[PDB]
Nucleic acid binder design. Structure first.
Lengths: 544, 328, 171
DNA sequence: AAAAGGCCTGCAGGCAAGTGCACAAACAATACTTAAATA
C-alpha cells in the first residue's frame, strides 16, 4: 500500500573455522601487498612532487598519471611557513570556467581557514592571501577524471591560472589523472597551452597492471597461501588467465575476488577440507568413508591395481572388505607434498633474480608447469637454454588430489560471477519449465504469460504493430480455458458478474496484453517507441 | 496501409481491469510460485555465507523481486544475522528504486545519521561543494580501521530504477558499497544491467550474481508506469457534465457524423451544420456556433479536417453508445 | 487554497482554528506529521477538514512532480483512528480524476462520490431566485419574460444572479 | 551471312510523399544561500 513512497526505510563448523583461519591468512597477505603498493604510489608521487628546482620558476610543474585509476588519494608535505593546499576538480564540478574558478576558490579558502582558525571568491584571494594568512601559498590541482571534462573549459581555466604567476608569493602545480592515452590529451588542448605545460612535466605511471611486479607477486603470494594444502587443476588456471585477460585496468581486485569465491565454494561444499591436516583423521565418518569411494583417483587406481596386480586377492581384500585398512590405503598418499608449488616458487625467484626476467606472467607459467610445456614457455626469451635442465620440471601426476583441489567443472562460479545476462533471461523465459513445476489445469496446458508471449515476440520483425501482435496473441489465447478459469471462482460476486460478459474473451485479452507489454518495458525487451503515439513498437533484443 | 490500430480494441474499465488482474496474479500459478519459493528458500544460508564476505548480492531473473526482495531481506537475513553477531534488528534500508522521487542528497542525509555520527561531522557540511562524496570518502577512511560486522543492511528494488540508474546516483552507491561493514543486496529488471558498471564500479561493487525467476506480475512496478489506458472515454465524462443546449448540439453533430468506428467520411460540413443548427433554431450565427463548439474542441472532444468536415474520431460503437445511453 | 502551490502553509490555516501558537513547520508539512497533528484536544468533538478551491492546488505546479504528489499525500486517508481528516474537496475541471493514480483511486480515497452539479437552466436556480425574492417588488415585470431571459441566457450562461443584475441595470 | 543505316524497348531519368529527428530554450523546480526570530 504505502510502498509507493520513496525509499521509506524500515527499522525492524570445524570446516568453517578452518575457512576462517586460512581465508584470513589469504586476505592478510592480500592486504599486505595492497598497502605495499599504496605506500609505493604515495611515496613516488610525494617524491616527484618536489626537489625539481626548475630555474624558470614561472610555470607550474605538471605531473601526469598515466593509466591513472583517478581514485589515487594524494598527500602533501606539512611544510610549515607555507600552506600546502590540495585542490581536486571533478568533471562534474566543471560546468564552465567561472564555476570551476569559484568552487576551487571556495575550497582553497576553506582549507586556508582550517589551517588558519568577506573574501572574494576570485584570484584576488591569491595576492591578498599572504596579507590575510601570513604564510606564502603553494596549491596543487588534482583534476580527478580529465578525459570527460570539456577540454575547451579546462584550457580556458589553465590560461586563467597562468595570470597568477605575477605575485611570486604563490606557486602552483598540476596533477593530471588521465585515464589513459597521453596522446588523447595532447590531441584536444590548444598547442599554445601544451607549450605552457611542457615546461617541466613527468610521465609518472600509476597502473596496478605493469610488468605484473604486483600481479605476478600477488599470484605468487597466493600460491604460497595455498601451498601443500590443496590443488588447482589446469582448467582452473586457464579460466583465471582468460577472465583476467579481458579485464585490463583492475586485474588484481578481480583476481582476489574469484580466488576467494572459489575458496568459499570449496569450504561450503567440500567435506574433505578437514583432511589437509592429520589432527582430524579421527574426524572420519562411515558416510565419509563411503563418499571417499566415488573419487576419480579412486576408480583410476582401482583399475591400475586390477591391471598391474594380476592377483585380484590383494586388491579385493584392500577393497571395501576392509574399512580401516581401506582408509589407511587412502591416507597413504595423503602426504604428497606436490613440489609443483615448490619448484614453481623455485623457477619463479630464479628467473626473477638469476635470469632477472620481468615482462612475464607467473600464472601462465604455473599453467605450463601443470602442463609440462614449461620449456616452450621459458624458450620465449632464449636465456634458460643453459638452465632448462636445472630449472627443469616435468609435471608430476600426483594421486588422490581429486579431493583436495578446486576446478570449475560445474561452472557454478562462472555462472554466478560471469553470467550470460541476456542469454540466461531468454532461456529461462522461453523454456520456463525447468524452473516452474484447482487451477493447475491451465498452468499445465498453457504456458506462463511471460514465455508464451516471448515466443510470439520472437517471430516479430524490426518494427511491429501493437494490435497485430495483440491479435496474433488472441490466437494463442484459449477462450474455452479463459471461461474455465474466470468462472472457476464463484466465491467472488463481482468476478462472477465479470465472468458472464459475452465479449469477455477479447477484453481479458487486452487486459493481459496491456499488463504484459506493461511489465516488459522496464525489463528492457520491448521499447515503447514514440510515447504519446504508441501505435507501433520495436523489439530491442534478439536471440543472438 | 490498413494497420490494426489499438483504437479498434475492446476497452475495459479500470475496475474490471484491476479486478481481473487481481484474480489472475493472485491465482494464476499459485502452486508453482509456492513450490518455487519453498525450494529456493533453502538457498538462504548460502546467501548468509556469501554476504559474510560482503560480496554485493545482485539478483536477476524474470519476475518482480520486490515482494521476494523484502521477503528475503526483512524476514530472514536481518534479524538472524543480527543474532548471529553474538538490540534493535539492523534497520533494513529499503530503496524504492521504482519510485522516481528518490534523490542521492536526501537519502545520504538519512544514511549519515544511520551511519556512525562519532564526531560532529555536520561541521564538515559546506556549500553545494558535494560533501556527499567527500564525506563518504572520509567515512571510508574511518571504516578502513573499524571492526568487521554489518551495521546496516541496505536493499535496492530495481537497481535500474529511473533515479538510482542516474550515473551520479550510481557512482555514489558504488563508493558507498566499497564500505565493508555494510551489506549490499539489490536487483534490477533492465536486461542491460551490465552496461551500468565499468571495472572501476565493478571493483567498487564486487558484484556476485544470482538468478531469481518466479514470474511475478510486477505489482508495485505496474503502479508507477502508465500506458494509454492509464480521448473517447475522456470526453465521455465531460459530456456527462454540460448544458442541455450543448447536449442537443452534440446530439445533432453525432447524428450527422454517424449517419454516413466513426470515420472521417461520415462527418458533416460546417455550412450544412450551421444550416441545421439554424433550421431547428439552435445556432444564431457562426460565432456562437463555433463558441459552443470549441468547448468540445478546447478539451479535444471532436475532430475537424477538410468540405468542412467535423468528424468524431470516437468509434461508431462508442458513438451510438453515447446516443443510446447518455444522450437520449 | 489559492496562493500556496505547496502542502505546508495550508495546514497552518487549519491550525488557525485552534487560536493558538505552535511550531507547525513539520506538523503541517508531511502526511505522517499531519496525522500526528490531528488528535483532538478539547472534548473529543470530531473535527473534519474541508479544502475550498483545491482547483488551485489541483491546478498548481507540474503534475507528476508536486500537484499530483500533493494530491496523493493529502488524499490518502490511512489513519488508524477512524476520526480522521475526511477531505471535502472541490474541482472545476474533471481532468483531476483522470490525473489521479489509477490504482489508488479505484480502491481508496475521497474520490468515489464524484458528485456533479450540472448547469441548472431554471428548475432549481430560478426557484432560488424566487425564494430570495419572496419580498417581490410590485412591477418587477412579466415572469414569463423573466423565464424567457433565463432560458435564452442559460443557453450560454451559468449566472442567473448576474442576469438578474443586468435586469436591475435594465430597470 | 555480316556489316551498316535506321528505329524499338530496358534502365532510370528524375522528385514529392513524407517521417524521422537532431537541432534549440525556456523549462518546472530543482539544490542551496543568507538574513531573521527566538532562547
Amino acid at each position: 500500500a504505502d510502498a509507493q513512497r520513496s525509499h521509506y526505510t524500515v527499522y525492524p563448523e570445524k570446516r568453517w573455522e578452518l575457512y576462517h583461519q586460512l581465508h584470513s591468512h589469504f586476505h592478510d597477505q592480500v592486504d599486505h601487498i595492497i598497502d605495499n603498493i599504496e605506500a609505493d604510489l604515495k611515496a613516488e608521487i610525494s617524491d616527484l612532487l618536489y626537489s625539481e628546482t626548475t630555474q624558470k620558476r614561472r610555470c607550474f610543474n605538471t605531473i601526469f598519471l598515466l593509466g591513472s585509476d583517478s581514485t589515487t588519494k594524494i598527500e602533501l608535505k606539512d611544510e610549515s611557513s607555507r600552506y600546502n593546499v590540495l585542490i581536486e576538480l571533478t568533471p562534474k564540478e566543471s560546468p564552465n570556467v567561472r564555476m570551476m574558478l569559484r568552487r576551487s576558490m571556495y575550497k582553497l579558502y576553506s582549507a586556508a581557514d582550517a589551517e588558519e582558525h568577506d573574501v572574494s571568491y576570485d584570484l584576488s584571494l591569491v595576492e591578498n592571501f599572504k596579507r590575510l594568512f601570513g604564510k606564502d601559498l603553494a596549491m596543487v590541482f588534482n583534476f580527478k577524471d580529465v578525459d570527460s571534462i570539456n577540454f575547451n573549459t579546462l584550457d580556458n581555466f589553465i590560461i586563467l591560472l597562468k595570470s597568477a604567476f605575477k605575485y611570486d608569493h604563490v606557486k602552483i602545480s598540476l596533477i593530471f589523472n588521465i585515464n589513459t592515452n597521453l596522446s588523447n590529451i595532447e590531441k584536444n588542448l590548444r598547442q599554445s597551452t601544451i607549450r605552457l605545460l611542457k615546461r617541466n612535466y613527468h610521465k609518472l605511471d600509476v597502473s596496478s597492471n605493469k610488468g605484473f611486479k604486483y600481479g605476478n607477486q600477488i599470484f605468487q603470494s597466493f600460491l604460497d597461501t595455498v601451498d601443500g594444502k590443496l590443488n588447482l587443476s589446469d582448467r582452473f588456471v586457464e579460466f583465471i588467465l582468460s577472465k583476467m585477460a579481458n579485464n585490463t585496468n583492475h586485474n588484481l581486485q578481480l583476481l582476489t575476488k574469484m580466488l576467494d569465491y572459489s575458496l568459499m565454494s570449496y569450504f561450503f561444499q567440500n567435506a574433505f577440507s578437514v583432511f589437509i591436516d592429520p589432527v582430524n583423521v579421527d574426524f572420519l565418518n562411515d558416510d565419509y568413508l563411503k563418499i571417499l569411494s566415488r573419487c576419480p583417483t579412486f576408480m583410476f587406481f582401482v583399475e591400475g591395481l586390477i591391471k598391474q596386480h594380476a592377483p585380484a586377492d590383494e586388491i579385493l581384500s584392500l577393497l571395501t572388505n576392509k574399512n580401516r585398512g581401506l582408509e589407511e590405503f587412502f591416507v597413504e598418499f595423503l602426504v604428497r607434498e606436490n613440489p609443483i608449488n615448490g619448484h614453481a616458487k623455485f623457477v619463479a625467484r630464479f628467473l626473477e633474480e638469476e635470469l632477472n626476467i620481468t615482462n612475464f606472467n607467473l600464472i601462465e607459467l604455473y599453467h605450463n608447469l601443470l602442463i609440462g610445456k614449461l620449456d616452450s614457455y621459458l624458450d620465449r626469451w632464449s636465456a634458460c637454454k643453459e638452465y632448462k635442465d636445472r630449472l627443469h620440471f616435468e609435471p608430476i601426476d600426483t594421486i588422490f588430489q581429486e579431493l583436495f583441489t578446486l576446478d570449475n567443472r560445474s561452472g557454478l562460479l562462472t555462472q554466478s560471477i560471469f553470467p550470460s545476462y541476456k542469454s540466461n533471461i531468454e532461456d529461462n523465459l522461453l523454456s520456463w519449465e525447468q524452473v516452474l513445476p484447482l487451477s493447475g489445469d491451465l498452468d499445465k496446458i498453457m504456458a506462463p504469460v511471460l514465455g508464451q508471449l516471448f515466443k510470439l515476440y520472437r517471430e516479430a520483425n524490426m518494427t511491429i504493430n501493437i494490435y497485430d501482435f495483440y491479435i496474433a496473441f488472441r490466437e494463442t489465447l484459449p477462450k474455452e480455458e479463459i471461461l474455465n478459469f474466470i468462472r472457476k471462482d464463484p466465491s467472488n460476486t463481482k468476478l462472477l458478474e465479470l465472468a458472464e460478459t459475452p465479449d469477455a474473451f477479447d477484453k481479458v485479452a487486452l487486459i493481459l496484453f496491456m499488463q504484459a507489454i506493461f511489465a516488459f518495458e522496464n525489463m528492457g525487451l520491448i521499447k515503447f517507441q514514440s510515447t504519446k503515439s504508441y501505435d507501433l513498437v520495436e523489439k530491442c533484443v534478439w536471440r543472438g | 496501409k490498413s494497420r490494426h490500430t489499438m483504437s479498434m480494441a475492446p476497452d475495459v474499465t479500470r475496475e474490471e481491469f484491476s479486478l481481473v488482474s487481481n484474480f489472475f496474479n493472485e491465482n494464476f500459478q499459485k502452486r508453482p510460485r509456492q513450490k518455487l519459493f519453498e525450494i529456493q528458500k533453502k538457498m538462504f544460508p548460502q546467501y548468509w555465507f556469501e554476504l559474510t564476505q560482503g560480496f554485493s548480492l545482485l539478483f536477476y531473473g524474470v519476475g518482480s523481486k520486490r515482494n521476494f526482495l523484502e521477503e528475503f531481506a526483512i524476514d530472514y537475513l536481518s534479524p538472524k544475522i543480527a543474532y548471529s553477531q553474538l538490540v534493535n534488528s539492523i534497520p533494513c534500508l529499503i530503496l524504492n528504486g521504482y519510485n522516481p522521487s528518490c534523490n542521492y542528497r536526501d537519502v545520504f542525509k538519512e544514511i549519515t545519521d544511520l551511519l556512525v555520527p562519532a564526531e560532529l561531522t555536520r561541521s564538515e557540511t559546506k556549500y553545494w561543494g558535494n560533501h556527499v562524496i567527500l564525506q563518504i570518502q572520509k567515512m571510508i577512511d574511518f571504516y578502513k580501521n573499524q571492526p568487521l560486522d554489518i551495521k546496516l543492511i541496505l536493499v535496492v528494488h530495481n537497481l535500474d530504477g529511473p533515479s538510482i540508474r542516474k550515473n551520479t546516483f550510481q557512482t555514489m552507491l558504488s563508493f558507498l558499497s566499497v564500505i565493508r561493514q555494510i551489506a549490499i543486496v539489490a536487483s534490477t529488471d533492465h536486461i542491460y544491467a551490465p552496461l551500468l558498471w565499468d571495472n572501476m564500479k565493478a571493483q567498487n561493487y564486487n558484484f556476485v550474481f544470482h538468478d531469481i525467476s518466479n514470474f511475478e506480475p510486477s505489482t508495485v512496478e505496474s503502479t508507477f508506469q502508465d500506458v494509454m489506458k492509464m480521448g473517447a472515454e475522456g470526453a465521455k465524462y465531460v459530456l456527462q457534465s454540460l448544458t442541455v443546449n450543448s447536449k442537443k448540439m452534440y446530439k445533432l453533430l453525432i447524428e450527422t457524423q454517424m449517419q454516413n468506428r466513426g470515420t472521417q467520411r461520415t462527418g458533416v460540413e460546417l455550412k450544412l451544420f450551421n444550416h441545421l443548427c439554424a433550421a431547428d433554431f439552435i445556432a444564431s450565427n457562426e460565432i456562437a456556433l463555433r463558441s459552443m463548439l470549441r468547448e468540445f474542441i478546447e478539451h479535444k472532444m471532436a475532430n475537424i479536417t477538410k468540405m468542412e468536415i467535423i468528424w468524431v474520431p470516437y468509434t461508431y460503437a462508442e458513438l451510438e453508445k453515447l446516443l443510446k445511453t447518455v444522450l437520449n | 487554497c489559492i496562493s500556496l502551490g505547496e502542502p505546508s502553509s495550508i495546514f497552518q490555516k487549519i491550525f488557525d482554528s485552534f487560536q493558538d501558537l505552535n511550531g507547525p513547520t513539520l506538523q503541517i508539512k508531511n502526511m505522517q506529521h499531519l496525522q500526528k497533528f490531528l488528535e483532538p484536544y478539547h472534548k473529543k468533538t470530531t473535527f473534519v477538514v474541508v479544502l475550498d478551491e483545491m482547483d488551485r492546488l489541483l491546478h498548481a505546479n507540474t503534475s507528476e512532480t508536486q500537484s499530483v504528489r500533493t494530491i496523493l499525500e493529502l488524499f490518502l486517508l490511512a489513519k488508524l483512528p477512524t476520526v480522521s481528516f475526511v477531505l471535502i474537496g472541490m474541482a472545476n475541471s474533471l481532468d483531476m480524476k483522470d490525473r489521479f493514480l489509477s490504482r489508488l483511486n479505484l480502491d481508496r480515497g475521497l474520490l468515489p462520490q464524484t458528485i456533479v452539479f450540472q448547469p441548472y437552466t431554471a428548475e432549481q436556480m430560478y426557484e432560488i431566485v424566487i425564494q430570495k425574492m419572496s419580498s417581490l417588488p410590485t412591477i418587477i415585470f412579466q415572469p414569463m419574460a423573466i423565464k424567457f431571459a433565463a432560458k435564452k441566457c442559460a443557453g450560454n450562461t451559468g449566472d442567473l444572479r448576474k442576469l438578474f443584475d443586468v435586469l436591475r441595470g435594465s430597470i
